[PDB]
């Protein structure tokens, strides 16, 4: 069933025609430019096949592939950074490997050895090393994907699967406005919003378009009768404020089933707790608490965290037909800038850290 593929059995097929690299100064739009190679591993009832780094090419899928009919698909997202010394380093990839496996088990997709996938990805990034940019605010986005590939129309356990990894060079704090409407629910307790599955994203496109029509940039996902702040778009939410007791704290919603356990989220919690300058807690945040904190002048900063945008400040929330100004930007944004500075130092290798995996 699952004996896993090995990096030692990795086959390499180099490209005959290397693609046109963007070049210095050229704008790198998110997920539009792809590298020369990709990783590919196939699975069936007998087990996993040999992993291979092959040229970037199209996938050949049967029209009845369960990935297209029943969303037997999941993905991951992590970044690789290149420092001044030309050394490429991956940001906490072990955590993405842990999350990917959990997503695989939830969709009855094959298990794999996390360290073997990590080594195969390390080798893929090494082959396409020249594609990783070295300018400030730039990186390489790594996109691992595991899909069901059963050539049948029954809603069941796939007897075939495909694991592939693609790479994208991405370029270079901008404040965002949010729509907070209780009618749109992203995830439910006992659901699958805590897993990075394709199914959680497609239905959010219309909600984002609805945010744009009301003058907002992103969506503030509310949950329950008390209107709990859960996520901001595809990012985890943090609030830096003076709490009701009078203590300065950094709060983010707890992992109770409706929150995707973000790697950047975990990193910000680790970093803030190591400093020991304020209280760091995982607690439910309601719109009433936020509103009362805003009118009492207790809110300092509100922001989103995730791989793509890193740390994204919030300046406005549209809730119950009222525009609420969030004092982020006016408060520095001190905490955001400190988090960004320390993350940039770790990521680009200015400061050595166990969080970075060298390629």
Q: Pick out the residues of the known binding site for substrate.
A: 141
CA distance 303 to 313: 4
Out of 12, 13, 19, 30, which residue is the one contacting its own copies (CB under 8 A)? 30
From the list 287, 269, 281, the residue with the least C-alpha distance to 245 is 281
Cα end-to-end distance, the chain, whole Å: 30
CA distance 96 to 187: 21
Q: Write out the H or E segment, with its range, that includes residue 222.
A: strand 218-223
- By CB under 6 A, tell whether 168 contacts ligand PLP: no
- By CB under 6 A, tell whether 262 contacts ligand PLP: yes
Q: Token digits for 8?
A: 């030692």
* Measured CA distances, 59 to 262, 349, 355 (Å): 29, 36, 33
- By CB under 8 A, tell whether 205 contacts its own copies: yes
From the number of C-beta atoms within 10 Å of its C-beta (0-12, 13-18, 19+), residue 328 rates as buried
**Which residues in the 195-224 window bind ligand PLP by CB under 6 A?**
196
- List residues forming the annotated binding site: 141
Q: Which is nearer to ligand PLP, 89 or 196 (CB)?
A: 196
Q: Write out the H or E segment, with its range, that includes residue 124.
A: helix 114-127
From the number of C-beta atoms within 10 Å of its C-beta (0-12, 13-18, 19+), residue 305 rates as buried
- By CB under 8 A, tell whether 71 contacts its own copies: yes
206 binds, options its own copies, ligand PLP, none, Cβ within 5 to 8 A by partner type: its own copies
163 binds, options its own copies, ligand PLP, none, Cβ within 5 to 8 A by partner type: none
- By CB under 6 A, tell whether 265 contacts ligand PLP: yes
- By CB under 8 A, tell whether 14 contacts its own copies: no
- By CB under 8 A, tell whether 58 contacts its own copies: yes
Out of 231, 251, 293, 309, which residue is the one contacting ligand PLP (CB under 6 A)? 231
Residues making contact with ligand PLP (CB under 6 A): 77, 196, 231, 234-236, 260, 262-265, 305-307
Residues making contact with its own copies (CB under 8 A): 30-32, 34, 38, 56-65, 67-73, 75, 106-108, 141, 143, 145, 147-148, 152-157, 164, 166, 168, 182-185, 188-192, 197-206, 208-209, 234
């Amino acid at each position: 069933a699952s004996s896993s593929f090995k990096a030692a059995d990795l086959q390499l097929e180099m490209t005959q025609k290397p693609h046109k690299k963007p070049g210095p100064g050229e704008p790198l739009v998110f997920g539009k430019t792809f590298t020369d190679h990709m990783l590919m591993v196939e699975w069936n009832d007998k087990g996993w096949g040999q992993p291979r780094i092959q040229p970037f090419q199209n996938l050949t899928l049967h029209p009845a592939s369960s990935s297209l009919h029943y969303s037997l698909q999941l993905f991951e997202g992590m970044k690789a950074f290149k420092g001044k010394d030309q050394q490429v380093r991956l940001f906490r990839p072990w955590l993405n490997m842990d999350r990917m496996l959990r997503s695989a088990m939830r969709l009855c997709l094959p298990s794999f050895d996390k360290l073997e996938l990590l080594e195969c990805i390390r080798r893929l990034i090494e082959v396409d090393k020249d594609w990783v940019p070295d300018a400030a605010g730039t990186s390489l986005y790594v996109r691992p994907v595991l899909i069901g590939n059963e050539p049948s129309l029954g809603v069941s356990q796939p007897r075939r699967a495909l694991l592939f990894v693609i790479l994208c060079p991405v370029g270079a704090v901008t404040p965002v406005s949010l729509l907070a409407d209780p009618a749109f629910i992203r995830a439910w307790v006992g659901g699958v919003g805590n897993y990075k599955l394709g199914g959680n994203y497609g239905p959010t496109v219309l909600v984002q378009q609805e945010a744009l029509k009301r003058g907002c940039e992103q969506v503030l996902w509310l949950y329950g009768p008390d209107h709990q702040l859960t996520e901001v778009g595809t990012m985890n939410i943090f609030v830096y404020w003076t709490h009701e007791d009078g203590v300065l704290e950094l709060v983010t919603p707890p992992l109770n089933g409706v929150i995707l356990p973000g790697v950047v989220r975990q990193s910000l919690l680790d970093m803030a707790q190591t400093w020991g300058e304020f209280r760091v807690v995982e607690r439910t945040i309601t719109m009433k608490q936020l509103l009362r904190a805003l009118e009492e002048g207790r809110v300092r900063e509100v922001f989103g965290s995730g791989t793509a945008c890193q740390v994204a400040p919030v300046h406005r929330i549209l809730y119950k037909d009222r525009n609420l100004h969030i004092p982020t930007m006016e408060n520095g944004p001190e905490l955001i800038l400190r988090f960004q500075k320390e993350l940039k130092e770790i990521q680009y290798g200015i400061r050595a850290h166990e969080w970075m995996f060298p390629v």
